[PDB]
Design a protein around this nucleic acid. Structure first.
Ligand code: SF4
Ligand code: ZN
Length: 414
DNA sequence: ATGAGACGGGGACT
DNA sequence: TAGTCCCGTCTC
């Protein structure tokens, strides 16, 4: 309902004015140097400016700034314009994305650029609503980031950083993933975003959550919005010797509930921590088959995953899925290897060790093998088989799991 | 037809 | 050391 207590609202316009001014003044003296800020500040063309912002905001989804920087630079140097990206192949996109994770982001970014160039004359949509509707991979966050940063639209955003900042600043301790709490956070973000500098405000709020209002041990003594933070105000009471008026059980007859407030956590009582369920275990066997090749050998066999599901369309060493009880077997692996190599001397199969790779939702254990051939396969290389030099593999569209497998193969090789 | 699960990898910190 | 948290979009 609209009957939330003023304890969780900014009912005083003076507080809103001060929140914006304090945050932006801190940003103007503390802001990190980032390549997408540099490209954006100097690109007067709106479409080129939005493209540079769009790429960075897709790469930043569930990925830390420190990781993105090098990928962003590589991407913008290879595809400086929408037009360049639209002509790229998905295979080239996966090559550049290799190691960044959540690979559908890269595919959708290319699909979007192709749509913009080939259906919209190269012109990016100019509001959060139309960016979200028309561009694949662009949800509510990315659309608001592009619109505010690139087009000066007055629209607030809630990423993980802003969620944490707002839950402390207004002492929201309920499950933040619920529809009700999420709606309240977006409403706060829309109230607070500076109408004159909405992009800088959004960037400032996110960088505050990244560098000051951090998940653990936040730097409250260094915070520009300290005086306006409910979380901070409460910690400074402690053994008190301002609170939420409507936080009383409607029932005055039941046992009176007690506060789950943990004094030893301070402002980190907010937000509530998401309870995490461990990933399911899966098992696979994989083999680096090698042949001597010519100059720059040996060559290793790579094959392409299905274009759906996990790590879709990426390349990998031939692999088979195994049930736990049969995770050390060779039968199915050798059958898969012979698909791509013809008849194989199965005596050469060398067990190297195991590689455990953690996805967000799967703990995958590979039994890793190698099979070194004395010469090329007897038959011509089948369609879908790629024989790569070590350097080509390192630059190919492969998952990090397969790079760990390759590093195990390189170590055990003599 | 909505909401939990699918979907990668690593940085920071204990 | 080994463990933990957490940096959005889409669907099946
Ligand atoms: S005072 Fe502390 S808890 Fe509040 S916003 Fe600043 S860093 Fe976060
Ligand atoms: Zn309350």
């Amino acid at each position: 309902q609209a009957s939330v207590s003023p304890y969780h609202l900014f009912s005083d316009v003076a507080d809103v004015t001060a929140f914006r001014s304090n945050l932006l003044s801190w940003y103007d003296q503390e802001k990190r140097d980032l390549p997408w800020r540099n490209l954006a500040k100097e690109e007067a063309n709106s479409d080129r400016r939005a493209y540079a912002v769009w790429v960075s905001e897709v790469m930043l989804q569930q990925t830390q700034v420190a990781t993105v920087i090098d990928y962003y630079t590589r991407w913008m140097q290879k595809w400086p314009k929408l037009q360049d990206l639209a002509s790229a192949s998905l295979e080239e996109v996966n090559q550049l994305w290799s190691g960044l994770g959540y690979y559908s982001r890269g595919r959708r970014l290319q699909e979007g650029a192709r749509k913009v160039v080939e259906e919209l004359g190269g012109h990016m949509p100019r509001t959060a609503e139309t960016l979200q509707q028309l561009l694949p991979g662009v949800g509510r966050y990315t659309a608001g980031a592009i619109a505010s940063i690139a087009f000066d639209q007055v629209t607030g955003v809630v990423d993980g950083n802003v969620l944490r900042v707002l839950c402390r600043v207004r002492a929201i301790g309920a499950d933040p993933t619920s529809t009700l709490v999420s709606h309240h956070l977006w409403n706060l973000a829309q109230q607070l975003v500076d109408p004159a500098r909405p992009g800088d405000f959004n960037q400032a709020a996110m960088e505050l959550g990244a560098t000051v209002c951090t998940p653990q041990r936040p730097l409250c003594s260094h915070c520009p919005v300290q005086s306006l933070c409910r979380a901070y105000q409460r910690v400074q009471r402690g053994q008190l010797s301002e609170e939420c008026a409507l936080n009383t059980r409607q029932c005055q007859l039941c046992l009176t509930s007690s506060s789950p407030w943990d004094p030893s956590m301070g402002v980190a009582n907010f937000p509530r921590k998401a309870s995490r369920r461990p990933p399911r275990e899966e098992y696979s066997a994989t083999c680096v088959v090698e042949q001597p090749g010519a100059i720059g050998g040996p060559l290793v066999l790579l094959v392409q995953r299905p274009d759906s599901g996990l790590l879709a369309g990426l390349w990998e060493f031939p692999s088979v899925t195994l049930e736990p009880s049969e995770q050390h077997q060779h039968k199915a692996l050798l059958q898969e290897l012979q698909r791509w190599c013809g008849p194989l001397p199965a005596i050469r199969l060398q067990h190297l060790g195991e590689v455990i790779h953690i996805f967000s939702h799967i703990k995958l254990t590979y039994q890793v093998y190698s099979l070194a051939l004395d010469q090329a396969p007897a038959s011509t290389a089948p369609p879908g088989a790629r024989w790569l030099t070590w350097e080509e593999f390192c630059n190919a569209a492969v998952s990090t799991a397969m790079k760990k497998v390759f590093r195990m193969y390189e170590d055990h090789r003599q």
